[PDB]
């Protein structure tokens, strides 16, 4: 007879995830400032990572955290990102204190808990940008033409963050962002 696995196994995640850090240092290229922190694939190992690293609200201006599925680099040129886009959450300066860390942790829980059900495979990762003008959080998905998947992810994400219905969030294609003239990227979808 063998031991009961409930008593001793770590609780596995559906996916292995990688957390990346972007350091604002303009003596270097964007790609060289983006570096891996570590990977995890259980609930326990997730918390061991999260509990020892700085809250987003404490990072220096211009830094990022990115959590992406193992094998997807947190850059839009990745084969799994290049045809996709992101649901973008823009925060005002006052929301760094009130909402930034709570929203980012909720984003992490949505990813590692596979909270988008049959559209989980469309999720690539998420990014938090710490910025003086206003922080941003985004969930990246793999294909901007997967209308059903993209819309479901957006609606569920907005509910999980607890945004009031009046607050509109937008989905922006990476290719649109990379090719637009002027500073606005249009939204392919809103929710």
């Amino acid at each position: 007879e063998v031991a009961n696995p409930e008593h001793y196994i770590k609780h596995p995640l559906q996916n292995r995830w990688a957390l990346w850090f972007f350091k604002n240092d303009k003596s270097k290229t964007w790609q060289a400032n983006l570096r891996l922190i570590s990977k995890f694939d259980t609930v326990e190992d997730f918390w061991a990572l999260y509990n020892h690293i700085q809250l987003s609200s404490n990072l220096m201006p211009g830094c990022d955290y990115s959590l992406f599925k193992d094998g997807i680099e947190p850059m839009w040129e990745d084969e799994k990102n290049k045809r996709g886009g992101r649901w973008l959450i823009t925060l005002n300066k006052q929301q760094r204190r009130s909402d930034l860390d709570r929203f980012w942790l909720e984003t992490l829980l949505c990813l590692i808990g596979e909270s988008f059900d049959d559209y989980s495979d469309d999720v690539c990762g998420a990014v938090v940008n710490v910025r003086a003008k206003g922080d941003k959080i985004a969930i990246w998905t793999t294909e901007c033409e997967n209308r059903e998947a993209v819309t479901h992810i957006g609606r569920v994400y907005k509910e999980r963050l607890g945004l009031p219905p009046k607050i509109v969030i937008g989905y922006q294609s990476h290719a649109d962002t990379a090719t637009k003239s002027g500073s606005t990227t249009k939204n392919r979808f809103v929710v």
Binding site: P12, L13, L109, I112, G113, S115, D117
Partner: peptide, 14 residues
Amino acid sequence: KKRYDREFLLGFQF
């Protein structure tokens, strides 16, 4: 698939 509720996940934080 392994799916987890937010409160289940939060129970392991401490």
